[PDB]
Write a protein that binds this ligand. Structure first.
Ligand SMILES: CCCCCCCCCCCCC/C=C/[C@@H](O)[C@H](CO)NC(=O)CCCCCCCCCCCCCCCCCCCCCCC
Lengths: 49, 182
Protein backbone atom coordinates (compact mmCIF):
# COMPACT_ATOMS: atom_id res chain seq x y z
CA UNK A 1 0.00 0.00 0.00
CA UNK A 2 2.76 2.46 0.91
CA UNK A 3 4.82 1.64 -2.18
CA UNK A 4 1.77 2.20 -4.41
CA UNK A 5 1.10 5.87 -3.57
CA UNK A 6 1.33 8.81 -6.00
CA UNK A 7 3.68 11.48 -4.57
CA UNK A 8 1.49 14.57 -4.17
CA UNK A 9 2.20 17.89 -2.41
CA UNK A 10 0.35 19.23 0.67
CA UNK A 11 -2.51 21.41 -0.57
CA UNK A 12 -2.65 25.18 0.02
CA UNK A 13 -4.98 26.95 2.52
CA UNK A 14 -8.44 28.40 1.69
CA UNK A 15 -8.61 32.18 1.33
CA UNK A 16 -10.06 34.02 4.31
CA UNK A 17 -12.85 36.58 3.81
CA UNK A 18 -10.51 39.58 3.99
CA UNK A 19 -8.40 38.35 1.07
CA UNK A 20 -11.61 37.90 -0.90
CA UNK A 21 -12.74 41.42 0.01
CA UNK A 22 -9.50 43.10 -1.06
CA UNK A 23 -9.32 41.09 -4.29
CA UNK A 24 -12.92 42.03 -5.08
CA UNK A 25 -12.16 45.69 -4.34
CA UNK A 26 -9.18 45.60 -6.71
CA UNK A 27 -11.14 44.39 -9.75
CA UNK A 28 -12.10 46.97 -12.38
CA UNK A 29 -14.75 46.17 -15.03
CA UNK A 30 -15.09 47.87 -18.39
CA UNK A 31 -17.99 50.07 -19.52
CA UNK A 32 -20.99 48.29 -21.02
CA UNK A 33 -20.47 49.86 -24.44
CA UNK A 34 -17.37 51.37 -26.01
CA UNK A 35 -17.63 55.18 -26.30
CA UNK A 36 -14.19 55.55 -27.90
CA UNK A 37 -15.42 55.72 -31.49
CA UNK A 38 -19.03 56.88 -31.07
CA UNK A 39 -18.16 60.27 -32.60
CA UNK A 40 -16.26 59.42 -35.79
CA UNK A 41 -18.91 56.83 -36.72
CA UNK A 42 -22.11 58.72 -35.85
CA UNK A 43 -22.54 60.40 -39.23
CA UNK A 44 -24.81 57.50 -40.20
CA UNK A 45 -27.43 58.59 -37.67
CA UNK A 46 -27.10 62.20 -38.84
CA UNK A 47 -27.66 61.30 -42.50
CA UNK A 48 -30.71 59.00 -42.21
CA UNK A 49 -33.81 60.37 -44.00
CA UNK B 1 1.79 50.38 19.64
CA UNK B 2 1.36 48.27 16.51
CA UNK B 3 4.25 46.84 14.45
CA UNK B 4 4.80 47.97 10.89
CA UNK B 5 6.37 44.56 10.14
CA UNK B 6 4.79 41.52 11.82
CA UNK B 7 7.42 38.76 11.90
CA UNK B 8 6.55 37.38 15.32
CA UNK B 9 6.52 33.71 16.29
CA UNK B 10 3.42 32.37 18.04
CA UNK B 11 3.13 29.35 20.32
CA UNK B 12 0.55 26.58 20.48
CA UNK B 13 -2.38 27.50 22.74
CA UNK B 14 -3.83 23.97 22.69
CA UNK B 15 -2.75 20.35 23.17
CA UNK B 16 -2.85 19.11 19.56
CA UNK B 17 -2.00 21.67 16.89
CA UNK B 18 -0.49 22.19 13.44
CA UNK B 19 2.25 24.60 12.39
CA UNK B 20 0.66 27.45 10.46
CA UNK B 21 1.37 27.70 6.74
CA UNK B 22 3.84 30.38 5.65
CA UNK B 23 3.08 33.73 4.02
CA UNK B 24 4.46 35.12 0.74
CA UNK B 25 7.78 36.43 2.08
CA UNK B 26 8.42 33.21 3.98
CA UNK B 27 7.78 31.09 0.89
CA UNK B 28 10.10 33.31 -1.15
CA UNK B 29 12.85 33.00 1.44
CA UNK B 30 12.46 29.22 1.56
CA UNK B 31 12.50 28.87 -2.24
CA UNK B 32 15.28 31.41 -2.92
CA UNK B 33 18.02 28.87 -2.18
CA UNK B 34 18.38 25.09 -2.41
CA UNK B 35 18.29 23.78 1.15
CA UNK B 36 21.80 22.63 2.08
CA UNK B 37 20.33 20.69 5.01
CA UNK B 38 18.10 18.18 3.19
CA UNK B 39 19.67 17.95 -0.27
CA UNK B 40 22.38 15.39 0.54
CA UNK B 41 19.63 12.77 0.83
CA UNK B 42 19.14 12.38 -2.93
CA UNK B 43 22.82 12.18 -3.93
CA UNK B 44 25.00 9.15 -4.63
CA UNK B 45 25.26 6.54 -1.90
CA UNK B 46 22.68 7.64 0.68
CA UNK B 47 20.49 4.54 0.42
CA UNK B 48 23.59 2.35 0.51
CA UNK B 49 24.80 4.01 3.71
CA UNK B 50 21.42 3.41 5.33
CA UNK B 51 21.92 -0.27 4.49
CA UNK B 52 25.56 -0.38 5.62
CA UNK B 53 25.11 1.16 9.08
CA UNK B 54 22.77 -1.72 9.99
CA UNK B 55 25.38 -4.33 9.05
CA UNK B 56 28.00 -2.51 11.11
CA UNK B 57 25.68 -2.40 14.13
CA UNK B 58 24.92 -6.11 13.73
CA UNK B 59 28.62 -7.01 13.63
CA UNK B 60 29.31 -4.89 16.72
CA UNK B 61 26.51 -6.39 18.80
CA UNK B 62 27.44 -9.90 17.63
CA UNK B 63 30.95 -9.07 18.83
CA UNK B 64 29.48 -8.48 22.27
CA UNK B 65 28.93 -12.24 22.32
CA UNK B 66 25.25 -12.38 23.28
CA UNK B 67 22.61 -14.73 21.78
CA UNK B 68 21.06 -14.00 18.34
CA UNK B 69 17.76 -12.68 19.70
CA UNK B 70 19.49 -10.12 21.92
CA UNK B 71 21.86 -8.95 19.19
CA UNK B 72 19.05 -8.53 16.69
CA UNK B 73 16.73 -6.69 19.08
CA UNK B 74 19.61 -4.39 20.05
CA UNK B 75 20.36 -3.71 16.38
CA UNK B 76 16.72 -2.90 15.63
CA UNK B 77 16.21 -0.60 18.61
CA UNK B 78 19.53 1.19 18.13
CA UNK B 79 18.90 1.94 14.47
CA UNK B 80 15.33 3.10 15.08
CA UNK B 81 16.27 5.38 17.98
CA UNK B 82 19.22 6.84 16.08
CA UNK B 83 17.09 7.59 13.03
CA UNK B 84 14.43 9.25 15.17
CA UNK B 85 17.02 11.38 16.97
CA UNK B 86 18.63 12.52 13.73
CA UNK B 87 15.57 13.10 11.53
CA UNK B 88 12.60 13.85 13.82
CA UNK B 89 13.85 15.50 17.04
CA UNK B 90 15.71 18.71 16.16
CA UNK B 91 13.97 21.42 14.12
CA UNK B 92 15.75 24.17 12.21
CA UNK B 93 19.03 24.23 10.34
CA UNK B 94 22.55 23.90 11.83
CA UNK B 95 23.63 27.03 9.93
CA UNK B 96 22.22 30.44 9.09
CA UNK B 97 19.83 30.02 6.18
CA UNK B 98 17.92 33.32 6.00
CA UNK B 99 15.78 35.25 8.46
CA UNK B 100 15.52 31.62 9.55
CA UNK B 101 12.77 30.35 7.32
CA UNK B 102 12.90 26.78 8.69
CA UNK B 103 12.94 27.41 12.43
CA UNK B 104 9.93 25.14 13.01
CA UNK B 105 10.40 22.21 10.61
CA UNK B 106 12.34 19.02 11.26
CA UNK B 107 14.73 17.49 8.76
CA UNK B 108 12.15 14.89 7.71
CA UNK B 109 9.67 17.55 6.64
CA UNK B 110 12.36 19.48 4.75
CA UNK B 111 13.18 16.65 2.32
CA UNK B 112 12.34 17.38 -1.32
CA UNK B 113 10.91 20.77 -0.29
CA UNK B 114 7.93 19.22 1.49
CA UNK B 115 6.84 16.93 -1.34
CA UNK B 116 5.32 13.74 0.04
CA UNK B 117 5.72 10.11 -1.04
CA UNK B 118 8.74 10.68 -3.24
CA UNK B 119 11.00 7.69 -4.00
CA UNK B 120 13.38 8.58 -1.17
CA UNK B 121 10.56 8.93 1.35
CA UNK B 122 9.25 5.57 0.14
CA UNK B 123 12.66 3.93 0.66
CA UNK B 124 13.02 5.37 4.15
CA UNK B 125 9.53 4.09 4.98
CA UNK B 126 10.28 0.61 3.64
CA UNK B 127 13.56 0.15 5.53
CA UNK B 128 12.16 -0.21 9.11
CA UNK B 129 9.52 -2.77 8.15
CA UNK B 130 11.93 -5.01 6.24
CA UNK B 131 14.38 -4.69 9.13
CA UNK B 132 11.64 -5.95 11.45
CA UNK B 133 10.78 -8.84 9.11
CA UNK B 134 14.41 -9.96 9.01
CA UNK B 135 14.74 -9.88 12.81
CA UNK B 136 11.32 -11.51 13.34
CA UNK B 137 12.78 -14.99 12.74
CA UNK B 138 14.99 -15.06 15.82
CA UNK B 139 13.16 -13.75 18.90
CA UNK B 140 9.76 -14.99 17.69
CA UNK B 141 9.39 -17.40 20.62
CA UNK B 142 9.54 -14.63 23.28
CA UNK B 143 6.30 -12.68 23.68
CA UNK B 144 7.93 -9.82 25.59
CA UNK B 145 10.70 -9.10 23.07
CA UNK B 146 8.38 -9.54 20.10
CA UNK B 147 5.77 -7.18 21.55
CA UNK B 148 8.28 -4.53 22.65
CA UNK B 149 10.11 -4.54 19.31
CA UNK B 150 6.89 -4.36 17.31
CA UNK B 151 5.67 -1.49 19.50
CA UNK B 152 8.91 0.47 19.14
CA UNK B 153 8.92 -0.04 15.38
CA UNK B 154 5.32 0.86 14.60
CA UNK B 155 5.29 3.76 17.07
CA UNK B 156 8.64 5.44 16.40
CA UNK B 157 9.69 4.42 12.89
CA UNK B 158 6.45 4.45 10.91
CA UNK B 159 4.13 6.94 12.62
CA UNK B 160 6.31 10.11 12.48
CA UNK B 161 6.93 9.43 8.78
CA UNK B 162 3.25 9.07 7.85
CA UNK B 163 1.57 11.58 5.58
CA UNK B 164 -1.04 12.50 8.19
CA UNK B 165 1.45 13.45 10.94
CA UNK B 166 3.03 16.06 8.65
CA UNK B 167 3.35 19.37 10.51
CA UNK B 168 1.79 17.88 13.65
CA UNK B 169 3.00 19.10 17.05
CA UNK B 170 1.90 17.62 20.38
CA UNK B 171 2.33 19.99 23.33
CA UNK B 172 1.81 18.71 26.87
CA UNK B 173 2.58 20.76 30.02
CA UNK B 174 5.65 19.75 32.02
CA UNK B 175 7.58 17.75 29.42
CA UNK B 176 7.41 19.02 25.83
CA UNK B 177 6.59 22.66 26.49
CA UNK B 178 4.86 25.16 24.23
CA UNK B 179 5.60 24.35 20.58
CA UNK B 180 6.09 26.97 17.85
CA UNK B 181 3.28 27.51 15.34
CA UNK B 182 4.08 30.75 13.49
C1 LIG C 1 23.82 10.97 26.32
C2 LIG C 1 23.70 9.96 25.18
C3 LIG C 1 22.84 10.56 24.06
C4 LIG C 1 22.79 9.58 22.88
C5 LIG C 1 24.05 9.74 22.03
C6 LIG C 1 24.13 11.16 21.46
C7 LIG C 1 23.10 11.33 20.34
C8 LIG C 1 22.77 12.82 20.19
C9 LIG C 1 23.65 13.42 19.10
C10 LIG C 1 22.93 13.36 17.75
C11 LIG C 1 22.04 14.59 17.61
C12 LIG C 1 21.81 14.89 16.13
C13 LIG C 1 21.06 16.22 16.01
C14 LIG C 1 20.69 16.48 14.56
C15 LIG C 1 21.77 16.13 13.53
C16 LIG C 1 21.38 16.39 12.08
O1 LIG C 1 19.96 16.42 11.96
C17 LIG C 1 21.91 17.74 11.61
C18 LIG C 1 20.94 18.83 12.07
O2 LIG C 1 19.69 18.64 11.42
N1 LIG C 1 21.95 17.75 10.15
C19 LIG C 1 23.06 18.07 9.48
O3 LIG C 1 24.12 18.38 10.01
C20 LIG C 1 22.92 18.03 7.97
C21 LIG C 1 23.21 16.61 7.49
C22 LIG C 1 24.71 16.36 7.58
C23 LIG C 1 25.00 14.94 7.13
C24 LIG C 1 24.47 13.98 8.18
C25 LIG C 1 24.36 12.59 7.55
C26 LIG C 1 25.71 11.90 7.62
C27 LIG C 1 25.54 10.44 7.20
C28 LIG C 1 24.42 9.80 8.01
C29 LIG C 1 23.62 8.87 7.10
C30 LIG C 1 22.44 8.29 7.87
C31 LIG C 1 22.94 7.24 8.85
C32 LIG C 1 21.84 6.20 9.08
C33 LIG C 1 20.62 6.87 9.70
C34 LIG C 1 20.96 7.28 11.13
C35 LIG C 1 21.33 6.04 11.93
C36 LIG C 1 22.09 6.47 13.18
C37 LIG C 1 22.62 5.25 13.91
C38 LIG C 1 23.26 5.71 15.21
C39 LIG C 1 24.12 4.59 15.78
C40 LIG C 1 25.18 4.19 14.75
C41 LIG C 1 26.20 5.32 14.60
C42 LIG C 1 26.85 5.61 15.95
Amino acid sequence: ILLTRKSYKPPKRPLTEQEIDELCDEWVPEPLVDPSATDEQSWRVAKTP
Amino acid sequence: STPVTDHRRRRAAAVISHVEQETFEDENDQQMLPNMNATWVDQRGAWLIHIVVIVLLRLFYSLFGSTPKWTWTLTNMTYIIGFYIMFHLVKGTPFDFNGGAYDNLTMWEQINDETLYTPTRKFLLIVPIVLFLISNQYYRNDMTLFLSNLAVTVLIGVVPKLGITHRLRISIPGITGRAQIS
